[PDB]
Amino acid sequence: SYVRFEVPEDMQNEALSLLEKVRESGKVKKGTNETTKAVERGLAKLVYIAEDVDPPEIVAHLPLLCEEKNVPYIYVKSKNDLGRAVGIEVPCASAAIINEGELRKELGSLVEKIKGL
Template sequence: MAEYVKFSVGKELKEKQFELIEKVTKTGKIRIGVNETTKAIERGKAKIIFIAEDVSPQELVMHLPLLCEEKKIPYSFISTKKELGEKAGIAVGTASIALIEEGSAKKEL
């Protein structure tokens, strides 16, 4: 487990996270990538953050959990950048995403 990963996510929760990300991608708004995620957190627009566990170098995302805790924004981890990118609807992996507007997933958040 990477140094910045503070907890592991069980299989059942991981599936619910994937459903949430896919639903928000289709009906809400997300920000993709470390820079966009960081801006969304700092501006107070992020509802929840997802961070890939396999980011290298780790320093790219090490600040995100700390920033989320400071701003009281929930965050979680996804196993790989590839999985996170796929669920966010892009053809490449991404280190992080921020859910900005819930869309039809409002009840699930």
């Protein structure tokens, strides 16, 4: 499995809420291609990876790429939820915050909580 660690539900919800709000004043990449490219460019502040992705090889490269680029990533249950959170009309396998907008402190705390796992 590409899921490297278990993420508590409340942290997932905090993450998705944060992503929704970041959409208002920041910049977000949505979809595996954009996300991957943003990561490769050194731009990702935080990446989201749905846990219910099939086939897994769609997002299976992400954890390790994020590690090489020193990018914190979090897992969320469903691509449906992620899609709603990034504000598109279809499911979404992975995403990234590129610019935290006004949520600098909230994002920082979130990534610390992630590292805490």
